[PDB]
Curated annotation (Swiss-Prot), chain A:
It comes from Drosophila melanogaster. Its main location: nucleus. The gene is Psf2. The GINS complex plays an essential role in the initiation of DNA replication. Belongs to the GINS2/PSF2 family. GO terms for cellular component: CMG complex; GINS complex; nucleus. This is Probable DNA replication complex GINS protein PSF2. Keywords: DNA replication, Nucleus. Component of the GINS complex which is a heterotetramer of Sld5, Psf1, Psf2 and Psf3.
Amino acid sequence: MDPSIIEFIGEKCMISIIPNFSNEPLHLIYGPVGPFRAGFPVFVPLWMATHLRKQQKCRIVPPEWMDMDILEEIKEEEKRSKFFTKMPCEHYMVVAQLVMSTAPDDVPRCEELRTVIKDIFDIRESKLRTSIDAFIKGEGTYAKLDNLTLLEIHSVRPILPYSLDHIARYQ
Amino acid sequence: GLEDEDDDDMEQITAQKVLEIIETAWINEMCAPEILPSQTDMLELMVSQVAHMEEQMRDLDKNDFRAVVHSMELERVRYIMASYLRCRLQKIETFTQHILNQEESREPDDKRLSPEETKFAQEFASNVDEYFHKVATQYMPNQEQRIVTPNLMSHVFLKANVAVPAVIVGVDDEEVDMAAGSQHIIPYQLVADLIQNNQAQLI
Amino acid sequence: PNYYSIEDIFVTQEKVECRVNTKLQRMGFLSDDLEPGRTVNLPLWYIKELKVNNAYFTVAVPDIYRNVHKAVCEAETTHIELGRLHPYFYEFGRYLTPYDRNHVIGRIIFETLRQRVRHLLDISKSDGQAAKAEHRLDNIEAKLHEAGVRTNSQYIEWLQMT
Amino acid sequence: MFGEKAFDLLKELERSSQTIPAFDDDGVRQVLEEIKAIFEENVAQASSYNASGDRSLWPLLNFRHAALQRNKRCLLAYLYERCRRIKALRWEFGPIIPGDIKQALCEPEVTFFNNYSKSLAAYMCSAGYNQGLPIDLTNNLRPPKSLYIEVRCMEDYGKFELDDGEVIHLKKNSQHYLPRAQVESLVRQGILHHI
């Protein structure tokens, strides 16, 4: 648990971009990568778009779950979500930060998305405290993940359990 | 025998695939009470892949792009390998007491532990006594209780990977309501069984 | 030889107000003979392993520990206030429980700390400068308190490249 | 005090966080002059007719037992925190640049220190390569670049850079014939937050 440790997890996820070159001094690295030729999309992980966009080589575009409309209806789904809601790729709180950091030289609508993603973030986080104001009787066989994410749950992990076990031992 | 295996065999195993093949065995070792099974195939896995890749780079050692990209990936990998062995080093440096009781129960095969760790363990267990040398060894004890990492109830978070109905398995509690994408939280004593099946996962 | 922690030996020292049932000899640290009944303070180490059924000393509790406050604080488990007149209050029974002969204390302790399962709704942040609420504390809840402050203080650093 | 001081025992290192002037071997001398003052009583009455085999002596046994407990475990702390923080900076460098002093080695700690150094020896041997490639793991993280130039830093002392330069003056203006293998030790000890 760190701000970057889970980027050695999460940053491996995939996006799809367009570079500006022909094939490089080497053409392709033996692996799942596809061939490099300007003017067309190519699918990549995310430990390069950092390296690439600021290397002034190419453009970049996001996945589809980054919008306004889908992330304006998912919240009203979440409002009645007595348990959980829709989960676009399940570590989407970090791709947004590493995209909206550099990318906004060309990306559209680079603030209102921040507005809505925090507006979902806070509501689900405050949800993930009220589990605790009902969690009774040492019920360590009954709890919630059903459409939970990861980037929230490290914000609880060292507080509650590390003491909860040796405390609520009595029941 | 039955070749075409995901290990070093008659087929190409991917850098990203070999990323996967121990990413889980790192992440479960991260958040857990005690030591988990050992693995040693990585050692001739990694350096074989890494050495071939590095010399393939050293041929074309002049470019600016593709050497750095190969190197970046190598760096991430070496990060994960170092972190894995570091955490196991710490947990054995702690759990140097009654690890030895299981190992003298059988000295398991490549499942539980690896030999160099036992080298370390006996090295350290001897050293603490020969440092205690200059405290009380003209009057060292004249005639069990020193244990460090026994506890098996630190509540962890599970990820199920199975039948969306309740696949009931060996575990003490009412493990009902297993799922495909879900979890009902539990501790570690009652479940050190599913994970050795790789049926379930941690986070 | 313990459930260690950095509080290695804030562990077996908590002093009591034990009574006397019958006579003893040669109190040592305080007569190879005495009367039946003379109140005396005692530590917890040597009493840790002297046979609850055996009767040199008696059914014996302290007064904050005596059932009156403790009962009305499993009813005042809403704002039982602590301070530093008894700083740690969270695993005392995790030795002392069975020595009452009136079986009262374990449920009290569990309800009190189940209130911390109810309490720490609020302690979720370090909003600004140094110190906020740093004297209602057992110093085991202080551990996870600092820990949560740490995790939030670094999660903050996550919230952008900051 | 009657078993309290270990929090006082590390206080030689109270300032020594990362701006450390130096370090010392505090707090053992009178404190283990104790232990030979007490064993006399701890084993005075061993199976003796001093009391003709009676129950009353049970506080004495536990007295010895708890005395051993406190002594040994404060010793474990004075050992392990020293090794652990030193292990942090010893992950920030091999025995290239050892401690600021090597005068605060509490004499038997030669075995302790060097064994942990040989921990990393085993680490190097098995890890990195099967034969053992000492795997560059926590310092000198420059992407592949030039091998020989010097640069500016922020005033470290200890002056132990035996690596491959005549005299480089490892401080601010360690600015001399520095090869790559010379400068192979530093990322964080208080040196190059600034090139």
